[PDB]
Write a protein that binds this DNA or RNA. Structure first.
Ligand code: GTA
Ligand code: MG
Lengths: 45, 100, 729
RNA sequence: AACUGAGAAAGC
RNA sequence: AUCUGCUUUCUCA
């Protein structure tokens, strides 16, 4: 399905990755240190 | 916004709310709606419920200090007072400038 | 791999060009950059493939361990290219590499192939568990119809199927939860749980799901079988000259069985009415009729539905009549009533005049839809009353809408304000009532707006309702809500023991529609149930084969040669109104040819089949006169008395008879004097030739003028373009 | 330096 | 009662 949206691809990718990382952390898939690394990378992004 | 809503709903195993909400609470594992009115808060709360009913919690704030939260009291009164004061300040400034 | 994806995103943002591409490009514009291509693609893939196959390494490998399993060279055959150019170059392999993988490569798991291509496996199962009848060589009239390519168990509109696929495979980035996400929640959940343990590419799974759900409908030439299980074999089912009997495997929906049964009964009745003792012939044909793979009698017994034709055939066969009707989602049972259908130039709300089918007379139906029931009393284009029982809101609304459409209420017609198409893009006639039903099912607001509301009933039990599906103070006009053996005549008329006709052959719908399943007639005269062109061609072929005997009897006999089974079947496609006039005209022409020495063999063949029905001469005792004898079905199905016709043309030069596109030869059955013989004596009944075009007589006289001439009065007749003659009575 | 529209088919 | 996502090939225009 074609992705719609007037916002930047970077914005959509960053928000999607942030949500995925938060879900992985809450569900326990990702370790706490890995979640910290992900959050740092997203912040610098 | 819809991606965030659907991701949270799938993770917490709750049926997707049929309308886009305002916030999602992990502690409550639910959704929170914000409707900023100017008259009675209870009337607008009932209007929102008539279409939502039990989909998610509803929080109503009015510039006249009148408010209406959901059946669960989660936020402490400090934040509610701060929000009401902010709304009152905005309303007073708008009325002073003849913008209200 | 959320962390890995985030690291990849940071790495990509470390590149300025990629950074600006991601920042500037919007989500919608992604679809543009996904198609970015600096070098134009080549446009001769067949030549390119033939060129590449004659090379070393045309195929491209996928970097990984599996590509490493492929040896660099096998028995002196270099399967894959050398790996000394790894740097930002890529890898390639030969087709011999593919063959080596198929020969000695690792043995993988086939479950993914079974899952993804389950549709094709079901197709193969249907083919294998199928039986083939006999191939029949003869004319076949194929009609181009929009038919479903492949069978489906749950067919949904493309957007609904796309939403279902998004929910199943992409629950998170699915967007707004739509109506489809709810009404197909069970299927979505079942597919998600079934697909939970799968590592197949999501796009491949989406295409599998759409193949399972989305319906592919194409215009194809069909002949008596339009069910998808038959459409997938259409290539083997029949052609323009042959027909293969096919019995597909798998289970068939009873809706197709009912539709095919209705078509079969209608064909049987249409072929029987013209026959002498129609009841006997109808029973004989119905006892040898098979719907796909079951006899017609069993289908009639086991199907709780049908139409007038099905009831007539049931009575003829001894089964009870099920006076039931289907109008889409609405199922009705005729409690009592009587009405004769007519074509009326109904004016639609949007100023469209349509020849809609209108019924007249009081009629009461026990109606039902979904889980709701009711009683609908109606008259000509009016809903007298509709007493509905309490049920679900949506079911009740559907029942009310369908009953409104069925009653053909004038307000219902005036309630159409929008785009409604009663003619398909190919010009074929869509059913007007069903199109109105489809329009009103969705855009139902205007129907209730124009229907009008009256006071709700105050009776003990009767309480009315409104558009909200609640017992409101105001009810829909004529709508109320409440909480609470036959014999068949020779002519196929159903009569109660009292002596009242309840249904007759004349009440059978004249529509000729392709059967959903393949109807077979296990009788020697199975072509007599064919279409107009098939019947015409078969009758004329029979005439040609027996031409010698027919002509000998005509010269010797007087009236016994006009009665034959082939001509009886041919009569079934001549309209009853014109059948007698055609018989009189053709018989007069043939007798006038015989009595004189003018015997045009082509005209004898042309007019002989029409000499079956009892003559119906004019009030003065002289036969009617015709220029073309119009046959039932289609505008081009007619026989030209003088000129050639699409169904019948003669070429004297080659003596070749082109009937329905098939060329027979009269060489051998002809007299060389016939070519010199004049066509003017075999054109008008009771008219002979006297001379050439006479200016004194006047201009060519038309049929109306010709019929009014007196004996011995000459006139100008134009046999065809460039051929005028002078005829006398 | 392989365009436009329509139809069918295949692949993603 | 069937009508109400693109790419490539071939044909037609
Ligand atoms: O597929 C066609 C037809 O064969 C099929 N059909 C008709 N009846 C059934 C049943 N009972 N089961 C399964 N399929 C059925 O639907 C298509 C209808 O095509 P056609 O044969 O042209 O229909 P017809 O010419 O009879 O007119 P139509 O309006 O479609 O009605 C068909 C059916 O409904 C009866 N009917 C409709 N209306 C509005 C009626 C009415 O006002 N009064 C009475 N007494 N009957 C009405 C028709 O008579 C048929 O019974
Ligand atoms: Mg909002």
């Amino acid at each position: 399905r074609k992705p719609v949206g007037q916002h930047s691809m970077l914005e959509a990718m960053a928000h999607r990755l942030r949500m995925d990382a938060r879900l992985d952390y809450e569900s326990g898939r990702m370790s706490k240190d890995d979640f910290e690394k992900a959050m740092a990378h997203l912040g610098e992004i | 916004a819809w991606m965030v809503q659907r991701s949270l709903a799938q993770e917490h195993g709750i049926e997707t709310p049929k309308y886009l909400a305002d916030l999602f609470d992990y502690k409550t594992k639910r959704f929170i709606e914000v409707g900023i009115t100017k008259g009675l808060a209870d009337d607008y709360f009932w209007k929102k419920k008539e279409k939502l009913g039990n989909s998610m919690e509803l929080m109503i704030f009015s510039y006249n200090q009148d408010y209406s939260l959901s059946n669960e009291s989660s936020l402490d009164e400090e934040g509610k007072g701060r929000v009401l004061s902010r709304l009152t300040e905005l309303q007073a400034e708008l009325s002073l400038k003849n913008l209200w | 791999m959320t962390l890995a994806k985030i690291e990849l995103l940071k790495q990509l943002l470390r590149d300025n060009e990629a950074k600006t591409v991601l920042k500037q490009t919007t989500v919608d514009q992604y679809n543009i950059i996904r198609k970015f291509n600096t070098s134009r693609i080549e446009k001769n893939p067949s030549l390119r493939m033939k060129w590449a196959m004659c090379s070393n390494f045309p195929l491209a490998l996928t970097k990984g361990d599996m590509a490493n399993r492929i040896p660099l060279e096998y028995k002196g055959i270099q399967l894959k290219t050398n790996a000394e150019d790894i740097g930002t170059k890529g890898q390639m392999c030969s087709i011999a590499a593919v063959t080596w993988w198929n020969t000695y490569g690792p043995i993988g798991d086939t479950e993914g192939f079974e899952r993804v291509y389950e549709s094709f496996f079901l197709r193969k199962m249907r083919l294998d568990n199928a039986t083939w009848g006999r191939i029949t060589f003869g004319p076949v009239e194929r009609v181009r119809k929009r038919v479903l390519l492949n069978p489906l168990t749950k067919e949904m509109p493309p957007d609904e199927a796309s939403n279902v696929i998004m929910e199943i495979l992409f629950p998170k980035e699915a967007g707004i939860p739509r109506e489809s996400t709810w009404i197909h929640r069970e299927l979505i959940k079942e597919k998600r749980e079934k697909l939970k343990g799968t590592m197949i590419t999501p796009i491949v799974l989406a295409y599998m799901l759409e193949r399972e759900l989305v319906a592919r409908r194409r215009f194809l030439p069909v002949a008596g079988a339009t069910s998808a299980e038959f459409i997938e074999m259409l290539h083997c089912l029949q052609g323009e000259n042959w027909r293969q009997i096919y019995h597909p495997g798998g289970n068939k929906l009873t809706e197709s069985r009912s539709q095919s049964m209705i078509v079969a009964c209608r064909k049987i009745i249409r072929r029987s009415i013209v026959a002498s003792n129609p009841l006997e012939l109808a029973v004989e044909i119905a006892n040898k009729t098979v719907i796909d793979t079951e006899p017609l009698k069993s289908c009639l017994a086991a199907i709780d539905g049908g139409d007038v034709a099905c009831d007539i055939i049931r009575a003829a066969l001894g089964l009870k009549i099920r006076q039931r009707q289907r109008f889409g989602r609405l199922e009705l049972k005729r409690i009592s009533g009587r009405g004769f259908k007519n074509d009326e130039e109904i004016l639609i709300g949007n100023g469209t005049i349509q020849k809609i089918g209108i019924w007249d007379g009081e009629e009461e139906f026990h109606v039902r839809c979904g889980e709701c029931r009711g009683i609908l009393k109606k008259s000509k284009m009016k809903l007298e009353k509709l007493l509905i029982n309490s049920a679900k809101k949506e079911d009740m609304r559907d029942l009310i809408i369908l009953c409104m459409v069925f009653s053909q209420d004038t307000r219902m017609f005036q309630g159409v304000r929008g785009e409604i198409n009663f003619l398909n893009r190919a010009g074929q006639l869509l059913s007007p009532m069903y199109q109105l039903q489809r329009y009103f099912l969705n855009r139902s607001n205007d129907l209730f707006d124009q229907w009008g509301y009256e006071e709700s009933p105050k009776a003990s039990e009767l309480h009315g309702i409104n558009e909200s599906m609640n017992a409101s103070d105001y009810t829909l006009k004529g709508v109320v809500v409440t909480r609470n053996k036959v014999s068949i005549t020779k002519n196929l008329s159903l009569i109660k023991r009292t002596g009242e006709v309840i249904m007759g052959a004349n009440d059978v719908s004249e529509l000729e529609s392709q059967a959903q399943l393949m109807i077979t007639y296990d009788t020697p005269k199975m072509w007599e149930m064919g279409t107009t062109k098939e019947l015409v061609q078969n009758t004329y072929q029979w005439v040609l084969k027996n031409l010698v005997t027919l002509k000998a009897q005509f010269l010797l006999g007087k009236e016994d040669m006009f009665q034959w089974d082939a001509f009886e079947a041919f009569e079934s496609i001549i309209p009853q109104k014109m059948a007698g006039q055609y018989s009189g005209f053709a018989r007069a022409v043939l007798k006038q040819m015989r009595d004189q020495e003018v015997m045009k063999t082509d005209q004898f063949i042309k007019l002989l089949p029409f000499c079956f029905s009892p003559p119906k001469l004019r009030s003065n005792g002289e036969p009617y006169q015709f220029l073309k004898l119009v046959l039932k079905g289609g505008g081009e199905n007619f026989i030209e008395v003088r000129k050639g016709s699409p169904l019948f043309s003669y070429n004297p030069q080659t003596e070749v008879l082109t009937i329905c596109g098939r060329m027979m030869s009269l060489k051998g059955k002809i007299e060389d004097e016939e070519r010199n013989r004049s066509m003017g004596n075999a054109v008008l009944a009771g008219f002979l030739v006297s001379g050439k075009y006479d200016p004194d007589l006047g201009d060519f006289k038309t049929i109306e003028e010709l019929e009014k001439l007196k004996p011995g009065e000459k006139a100008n007749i134009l046999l065809y373009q460039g051929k005028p003659v002078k005829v006398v009575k």
